[PDB]
Design an enzyme around this catalytic site. Sequence first.
Site, PDB file in Angstrom:
ATOM      1  N   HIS A  61       0.806  -1.223   0.000  1.00 41.01           N
ATOM      2  CA  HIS A  61       0.000   0.000   0.000  1.00 41.01           C
ATOM      3  C   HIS A  61       0.840   1.275   0.000  1.00 41.01           C
ATOM      4  CE1 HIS A  61      -3.155  -2.810   1.217  1.00 41.01           C
ATOM      5  NE2 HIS A  61      -2.381  -3.199   2.215  1.00 41.01           N
ATOM      6  N   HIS A  91       6.043   7.072   6.086  1.00 43.68           N
ATOM      7  CA  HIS A  91       5.650   6.662   4.749  1.00 43.68           C
ATOM      8  C   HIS A  91       4.971   7.850   4.091  1.00 43.68           C
ATOM      9  CE1 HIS A  91       2.097   6.089   7.296  1.00 43.68           C
ATOM     10  NE2 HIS A  91       1.477   6.578   6.237  1.00 43.68           N
ATOM     11  N   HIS A  93       1.827   9.121   0.993  1.00 46.13           N
ATOM     12  CA  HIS A  93       0.686   8.879   0.132  1.00 46.13           C
ATOM     13  C   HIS A  93       0.837   9.837  -1.044  1.00 46.13           C
ATOM     14  CE1 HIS A  93      -1.493   6.818   3.486  1.00 46.13           C
ATOM     15  NE2 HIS A  93      -0.750   7.656   4.185  1.00 46.13           N
ATOM     16  N   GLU A 103      -3.698  13.321   1.547  1.00 44.31           N
ATOM     17  CA  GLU A 103      -4.866  12.833   2.278  1.00 44.31           C
ATOM     18  C   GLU A 103      -5.605  14.011   2.907  1.00 44.31           C
ATOM     19  OE1 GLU A 103      -3.477   9.295   4.614  1.00 44.31           O
ATOM     20  OE2 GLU A 103      -4.523   8.402   2.872  1.00 44.31           O
ATOM     21  N   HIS A 116       3.825  11.044   6.304  1.00 39.81           N
ATOM     22  CA  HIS A 116       3.330  10.714   7.637  1.00 39.81           C
ATOM     23  C   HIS A 116       4.469  10.134   8.464  1.00 39.81           C
ATOM     24  CE1 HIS A 116      -1.033  10.382   6.087  1.00 39.81           C
ATOM     25  NE2 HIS A 116      -0.663  11.622   6.329  1.00 39.81           N
ATOM     26  N   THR A 195      -5.468   6.358   8.652  1.00 44.63           N
ATOM     27  CA  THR A 195      -6.120   6.584   7.362  1.00 44.63           C
ATOM     28  C   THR A 195      -6.159   5.336   6.503  1.00 44.63           C
ATOM     29  OG1 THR A 195      -4.140   7.282   6.148  1.00 44.63           O
ATOM     30  CG2 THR A 195      -5.366   9.021   7.391  1.00 44.63           C
TER      31      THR A 195
HETATM   32  N1  LIG Z   1       4.488  -7.144  12.660  1.00 39.01           N
HETATM   33  C1  LIG Z   1       3.927  -6.427  11.519  1.00 39.01           C
HETATM   34  C2  LIG Z   1       3.850  -4.900  11.728  1.00 39.01           C
HETATM   35  C3  LIG Z   1       2.422  -4.365  11.519  1.00 39.01           C
HETATM   36  N2  LIG Z   1       2.002  -3.462  12.589  1.00 39.01           N
HETATM   37  C4  LIG Z   1       2.015  -4.107  13.899  1.00 39.01           C
HETATM   38  C5  LIG Z   1       2.944  -3.325  14.826  1.00 39.01           C
HETATM   39  C6  LIG Z   1       2.861  -3.794  16.285  1.00 39.01           C
HETATM   40  C7  LIG Z   1       3.762  -3.289  17.207  1.00 39.01           C
HETATM   41  C8  LIG Z   1       3.704  -3.690  18.535  1.00 39.01           C
HETATM   42  C9  LIG Z   1       2.755  -4.609  18.934  1.00 39.01           C
HETATM   43  C10 LIG Z   1       1.860  -5.131  18.015  1.00 39.01           C
HETATM   44  C11 LIG Z   1       1.910  -4.719  16.694  1.00 39.01           C
HETATM   45  C12 LIG Z   1       0.657  -2.991  12.307  1.00 39.01           C
HETATM   46  C13 LIG Z   1       0.748  -1.671  11.532  1.00 39.01           C
HETATM   47  O1  LIG Z   1       1.771  -1.070  11.507  1.00 39.01           O
HETATM   48  N3  LIG Z   1      -0.416  -1.199  10.819  1.00 39.01           N
HETATM   49  C14 LIG Z   1      -0.320   0.064  10.090  1.00 39.01           C
HETATM   50  C15 LIG Z   1      -0.563   1.153  11.120  1.00 39.01           C
HETATM   51  C16 LIG Z   1      -0.801   2.539  10.520  1.00 39.01           C
HETATM   52  C17 LIG Z   1       0.061   3.556  10.864  1.00 39.01           C
HETATM   53  C18 LIG Z   1      -0.117   4.837  10.342  1.00 39.01           C
HETATM   54  C19 LIG Z   1      -1.194   5.076   9.481  1.00 39.01           C
HETATM   55  S1  LIG Z   1      -1.465   6.740   8.857  1.00 39.01           S
HETATM   56  N4  LIG Z   1      -1.660   6.629   7.249  1.00 39.01           N
HETATM   57  O2  LIG Z   1      -2.712   7.175   9.468  1.00 39.01           O
HETATM   58  O3  LIG Z   1      -0.272   7.483   9.247  1.00 39.01           O
HETATM   59  C20 LIG Z   1      -2.078   4.044   9.167  1.00 39.01           C
HETATM   60  C21 LIG Z   1      -1.873   2.770   9.681  1.00 39.01           C
HETATM   61  C22 LIG Z   1      -1.667  -1.953  10.865  1.00 39.01           C
HETATM   62  C23 LIG Z   1      -2.309  -1.897  12.252  1.00 39.01           C
HETATM   63  C24 LIG Z   1      -2.599  -2.992  13.068  1.00 39.01           C
HETATM   64  C25 LIG Z   1      -3.177  -2.430  14.253  1.00 39.01           C
HETATM   65  C26 LIG Z   1      -3.177  -1.053  14.036  1.00 39.01           C
HETATM   66  O4  LIG Z   1      -2.659  -0.803  12.863  1.00 39.01           O
HETATM   67 ZN   LIG Z   2      -0.302   7.569   6.198  1.00 40.78          ZN
END
Ligand SMILES: NCCCN(CCc1ccccc1)CC(=O)N(CCc1ccc(S(N)(=O)=O)cc1)Cc1ccco1
Ligand SMILES: [Zn+2]
EC number: 4.2.1.1
Length: 257
Positions: A61, A91, A93, A103, A116, A195
């Site tokens: 993504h 990262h 967008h 965004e 972001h 987002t």
């Molecule tokens: N091990 C693979 C890494 C994947 N991680 C897990 C990290 C973790 C750390 C400690 C304990 C548990 C998990 C999940 C993750 O990073 N996501 C992306 C989060 C995210 C961040 C910024 C934006 S934005 N565009 O708004 O800036 C939008 C989304 C998905 C997610 C899942 C839950 C919430 O998000």
């Molecule tokens: Zn973002």
Amino acid sequence: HWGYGKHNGPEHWHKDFPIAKGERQSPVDIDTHTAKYDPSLKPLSVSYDQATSLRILNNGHAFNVEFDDSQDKAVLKGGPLDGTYRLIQFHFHWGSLDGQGSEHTVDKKKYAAELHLVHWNTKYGDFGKAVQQPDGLAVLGIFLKVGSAKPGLQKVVDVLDSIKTKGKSADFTNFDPRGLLPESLDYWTYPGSLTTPPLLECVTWIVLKEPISVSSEQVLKFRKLNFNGEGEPEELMVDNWRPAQPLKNRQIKASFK
Ligand SMILES: NCCCN(CCc1ccccc1)CC(=O)N(CCc1ccc(S(N)(=O)=O)cc1)Cc1ccco1
Ligand SMILES: [Zn+2]
């Protein structure tokens, strides 16, 4: 699963992530005439001197530049924030053309891209716990416009050929994210959400007023990435932005007069 195409894009996300229609969703349009200066807001403290970047990943993504967040090395504090938030990744967008990609919007203006810088509140111990809290994350958002090159972005641009497709990563040590900031730290702030799915309502958004300029050649290289994995039909990674969502019962505050 979810993505940015016509059959799996933002208008579909609510079916698997019903919070998509929630009360504090992001991004939003920033109406500059309605955002109120809040003299109670403090200057942002961006302390990235000790940042430790590790790796760059195409996750299907966007691409994430990941940091060592096992210690307080690169932290965001002050502004609207209580406590200390550790940088975990940044990262972007971006769009298929320069007239779209951000965004957040500013008086309905779309920028070519949006950076972001994602931080989590250390009082919750780990990122996975922090995303379950209304004050768990702080995301610093920075608009990109196309003009002169951003020298501090070029090291990112030049590694993208090595992570063209989903699931590819590359070593990305010794990168200084201070080179992605604008001069001014004037900002707008409001309570919102991730987002992308899972769209959790855990973010204090801090959106800088001053965009950075990047060159056409720099953003063109973003647009050569792929959403697909290796050995799959090529789908260019473009237009990986969620549009503005309803502001509902929220106020956007300005740090500046
Ligand atoms: N091990 C693979 C890494 C994947 N991680 C897990 C990290 C973790 C750390 C400690 C304990 C548990 C998990 C999940 C993750 O990073 N996501 C992306 C989060 C995210 C961040 C910024 C934006 S934005 N565009 O708004 O800036 C939008 C989304 C998905 C997610 C899942 C839950 C919430 O998000
Ligand atoms: Zn973002």
